[PDB]
Design an enzyme around this catalytic site. Structure first.
Site, PDB file in Angstrom:
ATOM      1  N   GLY A   1       0.893  -1.139   0.000  1.00 22.13           N
ATOM      2  CA  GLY A   1       0.000   0.000   0.000  1.00 22.13           C
ATOM      3  C   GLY A   1       0.930   1.187   0.000  1.00 22.13           C
TER       4      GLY A   1
ATOM      5  CG  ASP B   1     -13.792   1.308  -0.284  1.00 24.08           C
ATOM      6  OD1 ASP B   1     -14.482   1.630  -1.271  1.00 24.08           O
ATOM      7  OD2 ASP B   1     -12.626   0.876  -0.381  1.00 24.08           O
TER       8      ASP B   1
END
Ligand SMILES: Cn1cc(-c2ccc(Nc3ccc(C#N)c(NC4CCCCC4)n3)cc2OCC#N)cn1
EC number: 2.7.12.1
Length: 258
Positions: A20, A133
């Site tokens: 990430g 999400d």
């Protein structure tokens, strides 16, 4: 294969699970030769809001350890002005990786995964948190059991970056516990029909317009699992107020009848 230390304990890196931005998840091994996941966050370039978003997700993961077994195990963590290391349970594979690997999923495997996803998402709702999400990549398979990896509080890629396929129609307009119902609803639709409800729409502007269009009939094909079609049709309602709640999903015939 480079080593690392977390609160005086040694962990030698074995592989790299994901990445990430400013982040990296590695498969590691400690001195008692057990296998763990270590999330490494680089804090060097990160603002006070980002930092506080990271400290908020840690605290919640630390707290929600006790409340549910459907939340990823957090064993330990080292926090400095420089970096975060988080010692978590490894698990078998993420739900996206598994769904991409096998063509068709077993109807029973589907109920168990569903029961697990509802239980996980319910726990965060019970604490004031809406992930907002949700994608199969947020769930970890740990010995036949699905576990929620994160709470979408901190600002990943296995090495679904900014997906829209699991996006609620209220998010396109813009977030309430009903948003997570839409997202979970899409994951089930993918586990039931092999694609997300709006997957077939090649264009993102055409896909975005379809989710919010009520005169854009979502198909719900006939399957032996009648209760499942109802779960699907109840979750994928455009009005959040007309969409089913998690407490109500947990008492639905689908999750409860043998
Ligand atoms: C064949 N295959 C296995 C995986 C895998 C994927 C995830 C994990 N376990 C964890 C444990 C903790 C986190 C965190 N935070 C995490 N995150 C990943 C990041 C990349 C996207 C999927 C979730 N994954 C373990 C995984 O394998 C076991 C190990 N090591 C992906 N493909």
């Amino acid at each position: 294969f480079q080593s690392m230390s977390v609160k005086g304990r040694i962990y030698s890196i074995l592989k790299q699970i994901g990445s990430g931005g400013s982040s990296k998840v590695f498969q590691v091994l400690n001195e008692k030769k057990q296998i763990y996941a270590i999330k490494y966050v680089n804090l060097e370039e990160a603002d006070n809001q980002t930092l506080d978003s990271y400290r908020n997700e840690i605290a919640y993961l630390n707290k929600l350890q006790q409340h549910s077994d459907k939340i990823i195990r957090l064993y330990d963590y080292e926090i400095t002005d420089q970096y975060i290391y988080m010692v978590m349970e490894c698990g078998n594979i993420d739900l996206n990786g598994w769904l991409k690997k096998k063509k068709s999923i077993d109807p029973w495997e589907r109920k168990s995964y569903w029961k697990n996803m509802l239980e996980a998402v319910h726990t965060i709702h019970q604490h004031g948190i809406v992930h907002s999400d949700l994608k199969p990549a947020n769930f970890l398979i740990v010995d036949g059991m699905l576990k929620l990896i994160d709470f979408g509080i901190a600002n990943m890629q296995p090495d679904q970056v900014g997906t829209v396929n699991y996006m609620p129609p209220e998010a396109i307009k813009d977030i309430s516990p009903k948003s997570d119902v839409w997202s979970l609803g899409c994951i089930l639709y993918y586990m039931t029909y092999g694609k997300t409800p709006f997957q077939q729409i090649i264009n993102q502007i055409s896909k975005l317009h379809a989710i919010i269009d009520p005169n854009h009939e979502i198909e719900f094909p006939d399957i032996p699992e009648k209760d499942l079609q109802d779960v699907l049709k109840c979750c994928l309602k455009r009005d959040p107020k007309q969409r089913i709640s998690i407490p109500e999903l947990l008492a639905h015939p689908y999750v409860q009848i043998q």
